[PDB]
Amino acid sequence: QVKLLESGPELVKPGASVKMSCKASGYTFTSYVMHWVKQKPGQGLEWIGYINPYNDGTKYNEKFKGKATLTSDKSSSTAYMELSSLTSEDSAVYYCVRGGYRPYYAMDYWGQGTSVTVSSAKTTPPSVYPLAPGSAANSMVTLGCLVKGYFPEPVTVTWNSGSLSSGVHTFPAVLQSDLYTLSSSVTVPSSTWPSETVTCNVAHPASSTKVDKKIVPRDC
């Protein structure tokens, strides 16, 4: 096998609409209902509605009445969900989910999810700032990298091009005034820094930017 091929991530402005799809393969499309479920980052699951591809019957969560429209095309075994009048509240991951053969309201095969991001922000490369300890700050030392004010997600952060990985902590980005900011820390033996070089490598494919910043001791 069963496979649900979902459409790519969506980045759209408030007030716009998006139509996502899920092409099913590995089973007979019309023999199962297709549900759609919304999940915001770190939050729970909310059922949007379902369509029965066999007879086009639909049922919608009243909470999504007017915002979601479900359709399907038997010829291409594809189910679609269109969301309208989008606001940032609609930013989330949306899953097309196959209902079970007999218990069709039980969700037995969940797709990978299509990420929808609703924002008025424009592509913005990150500002990358190296974080060295204050002049005043024993066996280990922690260094950091602040990746601030970029859009859209994601960015990839590595240390010494990946050679440093075990002592790395890269945190989920947070949204502030329409732009994302994240930080990453790396912990290494004090005997290795500053005697040896430690570099933050940041990539932001959306703006086609790559930045390498060596972490250097503060001149104090």
Binding site: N61, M107, D108, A132, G144, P172
Partner: protein
């Protein structure tokens, strides 16, 4: 709408231990109750349907019980692959609704966070902004409180926190707290402190620096 009340919201346990998650429906849903597991960064997977029937591939250590308004999912002798989130969902009629979820995490020995504070980089300052960053890494249990003090007084506005979920290798948690100010704002104050309150210490862990020192 029909409401599913799931508990506990959070549960800690060790490999080999037996745990139970419960779900209450606001109406009689007979045996139309399903359970799902969702691991970090993955889509959910069906575990149980019709309140007690195991889904394809689900180990016999899992069992669902109940019929009417009270249900439970029991996992006998927890295995490492069982940690993650669990959700209930009635499948009686539309609208279909889900419980709020239960996060099942792995118990390990306590660990105090390693706290590190960083003044704004000189590069950020030339740009006009001033972010003071604090990392609180590899601690357990997950509950932690971070307070920022500027010259002896707690500061609330301008703080953004981010947390990692339980580490798949050492079972600890980490957090980053960033106090963002304007450069002007930053240059008016002297002492900056990141204070962490965690069960490993009766007193907070305090890391600080003086802008002019």
């Amino acid at each position: 709408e029909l409401q599913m009340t799931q508990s506990p919201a959070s549960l800690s346990a060790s490999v080999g231990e037996t745990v139970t998650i419960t779900c209450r429906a606001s109406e009689n849903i007979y045996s139309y109750l399903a359970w799902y597991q969702q691991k970090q960064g993955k889509s959910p997977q069906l575990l149980v349907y019709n309140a007690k029937t195991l889904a394809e591939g689900v180990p016999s250590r899992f069992s669902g019980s109940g019929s009417g308004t009270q249900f439970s999912l029991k996992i006998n002798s927890l295995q490492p692959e069982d940690f993650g989130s669990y959700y209930c969902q009635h499948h009686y009629g539309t609208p279909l609704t889900f419980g709020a979820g239960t996060k099942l995490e792995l118990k390990r020995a306590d660990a105090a966070p390693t706290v590190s504070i960083f003044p704004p980089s000189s590069e950020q300052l030339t740009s006009g902004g001033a972010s003071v960053v604090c990392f609180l890494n590899n601690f357990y249990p997950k509950d932690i409180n971070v307070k920022w003090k500027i010259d002896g007084s707690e500061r609330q506005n301008g703080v953004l926190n981010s947390w990692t979920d339980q580490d798949s290798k050492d079972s600890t948690y980490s957090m980053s707290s960033t106090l963002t100010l304007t450069k002007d704002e930053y240059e008016r104050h002297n002492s900056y402190t990141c204070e962490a309150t965690h069960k490993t210490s009766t007193s907070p862990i305090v890391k600080s620096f003086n802008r002019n020192e």
